[model samples]
Target: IIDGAPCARGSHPWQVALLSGNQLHCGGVLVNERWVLTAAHCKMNEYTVHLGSDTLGDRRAQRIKASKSFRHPGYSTQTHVNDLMLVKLNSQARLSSMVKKVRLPSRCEPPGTTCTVSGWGTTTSPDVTFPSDLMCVDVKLISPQDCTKVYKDLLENSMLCAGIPDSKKNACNGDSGGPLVCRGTLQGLVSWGTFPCGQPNDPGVYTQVCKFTKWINDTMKKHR
Candidate 1:
């Protein structure tokens, strides 16, 4: 079974000590002292974000208010395009013990660069319907040549390919909006992957986080 792998799913939130519920499986980074960066879809109806060290029931955890959210104009719930968002907490994050931030990549990252993804999704094929605790897997970013060899009609730019070369440790369902973080920075966002767990030669695809720098900067400036 592809189960029992530790991941950044709930772990990341636990690191920041955030609160969470159903509806969206998103992850974020604190680029600033008071803001959290995540996917826009995670903020859909009846959705909320929580931060802290304990699990879902920790009352002592720090509660962050998403006072404002910014999603890209091209974001589409149907097509799932431009799926990025930033949230501003009501107060600045106390960065000593519980809450901390993840760094953004300094330069443009390339394909074939190694990376990892984490989430609370199913461990094996035919995943359970409900959400699970976070899990992580190591993978190398695939080149467009490799991607095109698979997905003929490829959306290579603004997107990235990752997973075991033979598709061993792939991101299963319920891993969406999670982080494909590396080198202390958020490099990619877990988006789509082949169903039924990991299929041979089929890997997971993510929205390259670095591609949206312009949008992200603009959004932060507007909210600030």
Candidate 2:
């Protein structure tokens, strides 16, 4: 994985939004020159990606659009499974000083590898706001072999587990559709986690990007 610091440092940050003008969420990894792989549910009301440069402070580095979205056919909020989506732009992105793509893991991170998730999420102590400037947290890869131990009948083929139970760090409510990246590779799209905020025995659920790679590739090819 690329160093967490450099990954979120403006070279490969993902974008998320909930409304036409008001950006509500944050995700990880720049999937392509023009698309972002994020949680299917995160594109709430509206979403358009703006890559190039990690900081959202500069307007020039941003690329905004109404966005054409494609969600997993099996997405279901009730079960909170299949939580993934893609935001496609009208034109291929013109990479500026800050825009670039992150590597996509061919498979899941090997169990026990320390992964990192970056977003504008909340902290445990008094609900303090974590850095919206892309704060990173170290997490662990949860093997599908042992996933049953942590989750009940998880769609493991399309999911990956990261983070330790009772750990102080995690992607909170606003961090949905973000990334659970490892070694600079896009691994999982942050979707569901402990509902009651921070608690033990709760694992964050992400949409397995690799499992859907073929589908994404096929769909994008059809569109492009």
Candidate 3:
């Protein structure tokens, strides 16, 4: 997370680090014992997930391999619409003090609502690479009207906009797929943002999880 703080231990129980091979690919959130929510664009041939720890390479974290992945059929690379994905773990994740699932939201959070986004992404635009520990930033949701105005046709019902435009406190590279929690409900996932990060007119964009609960539920059921 760009301009975010080091996440305290156990601050985000559902947080998970997606690894493409040994590289930190993207951030994710565990929605259940066996499934994780992430961005469809983060898909890779091989995947692994680090759970239970904020820092990377911690022995205490459960390192689980992915069994399968499901990306939204409506996802489009052209416009980045519906950029959501689900990863099924090779085995069930055991419940513990540090490992847990986030509760999904039933509706969209109104504009101006404060929310938290956590991840293990780089803190600075280009000053650093992937961080060892997770980071989090508190941000406010931008009104759909404002977001649409800025993003134009890129804006869609599946996306949520957030950040105080010029605050310079926002999600940057590698934060994609990270959870956006509002009032303890899993409401969004990191999707995209302007390059150089924290742009003056560009608020970070997110995949509104509330808009896809039916797909999440139906897909999990069909797979099980």
Candidate 4:
């Protein structure tokens, strides 16, 4: 990880960088050899999926074109509900030590669960500039009650909340579509957060994975 952290490279091999014309725009996670999961709100006309690279612009990075993209049918742009999506690569990614798929959720992550979010997003608040390498930060899952209190009716059944209270270690701008791994399972995707990035008690919003497992399975089966 970057920011002078000690986390080893390739620790989270499923992480993928969604690039638009050589610019790292959003994050994604490899769920299968040909499928990647990301935020529907980050939809773009085209994207180059970059895998197996810790550092941005690494020559060894495995870059592939997205043949098709699918956004949740129920996704609402106004409210940002059901903000999840899938991208099908033109060719299957070669599974290597550095390139791998993340495990799908088998259950909902309970409140207070410690999770890790990794991405090449902005490390500092206010201004969204990316780090040279992927970065990760630990955050605690917040209860729905507490999350509702903070977001004030913005919380939905399809969303989850997590963060480091009163700390600046939470995911911010440019971190959209990244994985939120809880107990080594893909539990959430970075959806949205308050202004100025990480604010005290202002946790990052995520697309709740467990709540959409059936939808994901059915969609993948249809497309696979």
lDDT winner: 3
Clash count per candidate: 12, 10, 0, 0
- Tens digits of lDDT, candidate 4, 1-224: 11224237779889998988898789989989989999998798788999988888888989999968899999999999999998888899989999998999889989999999888887766765668788888888999898988888788988999987666667876679999999989999999997788677778899999998888778889996
lDDT of each: 0.63, 0.63, 0.89, 0.86
RMSD of 1: 3.4
TM-score of each: 0.80, 0.82, 0.97, 0.95
After superposition, the stretches of candidate 3 with alpha carbons farther than 4 Å from their true spots are none
Task: Please provide, for model 2 over 1-224, each residue's C-alpha lDDT reduced to its tens digit, 9 standing for 90 to 100.
Answer: 11123234653445433333645455645567767677777654456555655445457666666458787888886776778776776667666556666676677567787877766555442354544355566778777766667676755577787776556455676667777778767777787776565455455677777777787777667766
List where candidate 4 sits over 4 angstroms from the true fold.
1-7
Summarize candidate 3's per-residue lDDT along 35-109 as a digit string, tens digits: 999999998766899999988999988999996999999999889899999999999998899998989997788
RMSD of each: 3.4, 3.7, 1.1, 1.8
| Model number with the top TM-score | 3
lDDT of 4 at 94: 89
lDDT of 3 at 207: 95
Comparing 2 and 4 by lDDT, which wins?
Answer: 4
- Model 1 per-residue lDDT tens digits across residues 1-224: 13326653334642331235534355556667767766666664333555554243357556565556767788777766676777777777666455566666666567667776766556677746433344667787887688878876746577778766655677765566667776667887666776676887886777778888777777778776
